[PDB]
Amino acid sequence: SHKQLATEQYRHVEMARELAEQSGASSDLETDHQAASDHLNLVQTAMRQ
Amino acid sequence: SHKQLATEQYRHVEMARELAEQSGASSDLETDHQAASDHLNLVQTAMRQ
Amino acid sequence: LQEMKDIGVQADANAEMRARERRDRLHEALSVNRSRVNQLEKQIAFCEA
Amino acid sequence: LQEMKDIGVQADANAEMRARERRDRLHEALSVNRSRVNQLEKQIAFCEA
């Protein structure tokens, strides 16, 4: 049982690490998407003028 | 033991029956805040005018 | 001016900053609500299992 | 026309709807990715506990 516990610990560490990576990615994307919506509004205004 | 766990389950059912509603409300609020930011952008545009 | 009133926005700088700040604060508070829902759902899962 | 030069955005209608589509699908894809990351993280916490 000790060996299985250690192995599960290893697997958990790996998954947690990669998920931290994905969280950072998601935040960066959030910033990108804010900029994106701003651009959309700009374009609409240019249309009208 | 038998009497403890059922009650604990029911308490958790209540808690989930609160969390789901908070979640739905949060999503609707997200849409509302998007609309609010749209209004902000309208005001921003009106500044120059 | 007719365009102003057709859009109908009051377009006062003070109200602009106030509205934008309020909507940003509501964005942040709503994000907090979503996070809170996430943590409590985590707790639901832990307790149930 | 000077204002059009100032904004500088080429802002074509084809480009307009294209951009809005791109950015909106981008928003929704972002949200979905965030949800998936959260789901996986919750799984990992389950395993650890």
Side-chain angles (χ1 to χ4, degrees):
Chain A
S1 192
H2 180 192
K3 57 193 66 178
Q4 311 310 66
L5 187 146
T7 306
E8 168 36 37
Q9 180 48 246
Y10 176 74
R11 303 162 73 268
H12 159 279
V13 164
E14 171 268 347
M15 301 166 248
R17 176 274 313 164
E18 61 81 14
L19 277 188
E21 304 169 9
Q22 319 326 327
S23 77
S26 83
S27 67
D28 300 329
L29 300 171
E30 276 277 10
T31 313
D32 291 331
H33 288 78
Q34 293 179 356
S37 63
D38 307 315
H39 167 227
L40 299 194
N41 285 250
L42 285 160
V43 178
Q44 309 334 307
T45 309
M47 294 298 102
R48 290 183 297 92
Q49 289 182 43
Chain B
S1 183
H2 192 186
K3 79 210 303 178
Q4 173 186 347
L5 297 146
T7 65
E8 208 48 47
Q9 294 175 328
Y10 309 141
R11 189 184 69 81
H12 307 329
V13 174
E14 293 178 323
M15 301 145 58
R17 293 294 88 197
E18 307 310 326
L19 306 196
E21 296 60 25
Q22 290 206 8
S23 65
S26 83
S27 67
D28 204 40
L29 297 160
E30 286 301 354
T31 64
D32 312 327
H33 301 344
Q34 294 157 8
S37 65
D38 179 358
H39 158 68
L40 304 181
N41 290 138
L42 166 55
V43 182
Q44 293 164 354
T45 314
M47 295 298 102
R48 277 83 70 189
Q49 311 153 238
Chain C
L1 287 169
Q2 182 58 54
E3 162 54 10
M4 295 298 102
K5 311 328 298 170
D6 306 332
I7 63 174
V9 64
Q10 52 76 29
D12 306 326
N14 63 320
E16 181 279 332
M17 283 73 74
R18 297 309 82 84
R20 88 161 175 262
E21 292 143 19
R22 278 149 60 202
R23 309 327 165 207
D24 310 337
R25 296 314 75 79
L26 293 172
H27 280 114
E28 293 136 32
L30 176 55
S31 79
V32 169
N33 312 342
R34 295 195 276 95
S35 77
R36 186 268 187 189
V37 169
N38 310 342
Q39 291 99 27
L40 276 70
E41 287 292 3
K42 285 187 166 187
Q43 301 335 295
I44 301 299
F46 305 140
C47 77
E48 196 73 25
Chain D
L1 181 57
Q2 165 53 15
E3 180 59 29
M4 290 325 88
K5 307 324 184 179
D6 174 279
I7 190 166
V9 69
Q10 60 82 30
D12 293 333
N14 171 242
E16 183 288 300
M17 73 291 291
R18 274 181 300 131
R20 69 162 62 213
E21 301 143 26
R22 271 150 38 200
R23 305 309 192 176
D24 302 333
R25 58 90 171 175
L26 266 178
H27 295 285
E28 55 80 17
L30 181 154
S31 73
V32 179
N33 316 330
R34 181 175 59 84
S35 77
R36 301 195 229 91
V37 167
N38 305 336
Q39 167 50 239
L40 302 161
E41 282 205 338
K42 297 151 77 177
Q43 299 157 10
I44 286 175
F46 305 165
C47 297
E48 181 192 322

